Amino acid sequence: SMEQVAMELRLTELTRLLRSVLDQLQDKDPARIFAQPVSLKEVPDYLDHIKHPMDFATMRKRLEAQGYKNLHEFEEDFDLIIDNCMKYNARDTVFYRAAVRLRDQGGVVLRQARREVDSIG
Question: Where does the entry say this protein is expressed, by tissue?
Fold first, then answer.
């Protein structure tokens, strides 16, 4: 149908905007701490601690399959990256601290993304 096509164009354009959001948030992690999944070879107990692992590569795979329907879904995955790290790692670690800085700097980006998603519809 033509309605299905219009819906698909809307999803495509959200995907475009989320790709730009992802790139901007990933720039706030210049150490690449969050770039890839925590390795279960290197952290064998990880899944005993963290039930829903997340990382920027996994988000990018979902994004490119157009698997984010709305900005809330995308934000949920970004908050998992941060929240997982802040539980597994102690406050005195470069990992925890990187997550704090990513959360603080990402908030700015996400605030305007929400306005753009609502504004453009």
Answer: Highly expressed in testis.
